[PDB]
Amino acid sequence: SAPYPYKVQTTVPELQYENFDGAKFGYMFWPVQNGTNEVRGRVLLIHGFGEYTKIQFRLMDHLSLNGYESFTFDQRGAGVTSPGRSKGVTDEYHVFNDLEHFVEKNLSECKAKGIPLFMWGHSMGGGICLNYACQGKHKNEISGYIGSGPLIILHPHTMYNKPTQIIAPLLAKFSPRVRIDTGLDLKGITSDKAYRAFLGSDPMSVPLYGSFRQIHDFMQRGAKLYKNENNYIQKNFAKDKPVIIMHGQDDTINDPKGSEKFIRDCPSADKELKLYPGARHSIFSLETDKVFNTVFNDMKQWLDKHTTTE
Numbered sequence: 037s038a039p040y041p042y043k044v045q046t047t048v049p050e051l052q053y054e055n056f057d058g059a060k061f062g063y064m065f066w067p068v069q070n071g072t073n074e075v076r077g078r079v080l081l082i083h084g085f086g087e088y089t090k091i092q093f094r095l096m097d098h099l100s101l102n103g104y105e106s107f108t109f110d111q112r113g114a115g116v117t118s119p120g121r122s123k124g125v126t127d128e129y130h131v132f133n134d135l136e137h138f139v140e141k142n143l144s145e146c147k148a149k150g151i152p153l154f155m156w157g158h159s160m161g162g163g164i165c166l167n168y169a170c171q172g173k174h175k176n177e178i179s180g181y182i183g184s185g186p187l188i189i190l191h192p193h194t195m196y197n198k199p200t201q202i203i204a205p206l207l208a209k210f211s212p213r214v215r216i217d218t219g220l221d222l223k224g225i226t227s228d229k230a231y232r233a234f235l236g237s238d239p240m241s242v243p244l245y246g247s248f249r250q251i252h253d254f255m256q257r258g259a260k261l262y263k264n265e266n267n268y269i270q271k272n273f274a275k276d277k278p279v280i281i282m283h284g285q286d287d288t289i290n291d292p293k294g295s296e297k298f299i300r301d302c303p304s305a306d307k308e309l310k311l312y313p314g315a316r317h318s319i320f321s322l323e324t325d326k327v328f329n330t331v332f333n334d335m336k337q338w339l340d341k342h343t344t345t346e
Contacts, residue, residue: 037237041230044093046100051089051116056137057130062116063109063138064089066096070103076343077152077179080142081108082135082161084187084318085254086220086244088115091321094328095156102336105151107142113250115240124215124246128253131164136173143174152179152343158320159290162186162281163258166298169279170272178274180342182335183281184320188258188294191287194224201251208252215245224289224317231322262294269301278306280338282331284315284323310334 046069054061068075079099081092088110096106110117112134113126139153146153155178157165162183169181195202198218207214220242222232235241261269279302281295292311299309312319315327323331 037239038233040090040093040234041228042094042097044097046097048093056134059112059117059122059134061109061112061134061138062089063107064096066100066106066108068103068105069100072103074103075105075149075151076103077154077339078105078107078142078146079154079156079182079339080139081106082155082157082164083108083111083114084157084159084161085114085246086241087158087161087321088240090238090240091318095320095332098332098336104336104339107138109138113247124250125213126247126250126253128257131253132168132171135164135168139172139174139178143177154178154180154182154339154342156182156184157186158184158318159187160254162290163188163254163261166261166279166281167257169274169277170269172274175274176277178277180278180339181280182338183279183283183295183298185283185287185290185292185317186258186281186295186298187254187290188298189262189291190255191289191291193288194221194290197221201255204246204248205252205255208248212247212249212252214248216248216251217243217245220244221289224287226318226322226324227286227314227316227327228322228324231318235322258294261298264297264301267301269298270303273303275303276305278338278342279304280308280310280335282310282312282319282334284317284319284327285311285313286315287317289317 049064113124283295319331
């Protein structure tokens with residue numbers, strides 16, 4: 037198959053397992069490896085639909101080099117956590133209940149070190165991340181929220197070409213356990229053909245199954261934020277918690293309109309949207325070196341700013 041285009045510079049952590057609520061979660065703890073020892077903070081990574089640990093290698097590697105710990109886990113319905121039958125089998129309840137478990141785990145481990153815990157999410161993970169800031173049990177304990185092209189509203193290009201993504205949530209209630217594979221939009225995901233070749237050949241990426249229940253729940257998740265009925269965001273967003281959304285300008289999978297409106301509606305004093313020209317969907321994982329460097333540096337500087345002491 038096609039090789040993983042990125043060369044990891046630090047030591048790749050042990051793929052670790054932990055049982056919770058009837059699922060064996062695969063997870064990784066990526067330690068700071070930059071010669072100095074010290075840690076400025078830890079970032080919890082919430083992957084997107086169809087993603088898993090390896091996809092966030094590029095991000096965790098760079099974070100490790102710049103004094104930041106990472107924690108990620110294959111969520112229920114994805115990765116090595118839910119193979120075969122269970123692939124795509126999850127719902128709104130499990131999504132956040134599983135999340136609370138791993139938040140408290142990292143919170144406990146960061147408690148001893150006295151280091152801040154940040155939350156990061158891409159696409160589907162971005163929608164989960166921004167929602168956790170509104171509904172999370174420990175939303176006021178998270179030091180900052182980072183969204184990577186968060187799934188708020190689909191881009192018209194995706195809705196027109198993949199109408200099944202509209203039908204599946206519509207038929208979810210009636211037929212929840214129907215699982216479906218819509219295929220990867222490689223051109224929409226990234227502009228770099230090197231990562232395109234890898235993704236299309238990656239056995240852990242293809243095929244990609246999702247249940248109607250799963251799909252409906254993260255589709256509705258984002259729509260809830262976009263509609264913002266009765267000022268849901270203003271009322272429930274964790275008071276004055278730093279937010280930053282990073283979103284490719286040429287993203288034709290998740291509409292930049294969603295991120296623009298979310299930042300507008302967000303009541304926090306420390307909020308920002310960054311749009312990246314020439315960039316597409318997977319800006320933190322599968323895009324070009326030029327795009328990734330620009331995108332990661334903004335995140336790195338943003339993290340430093342919210343861990344600056346003396």
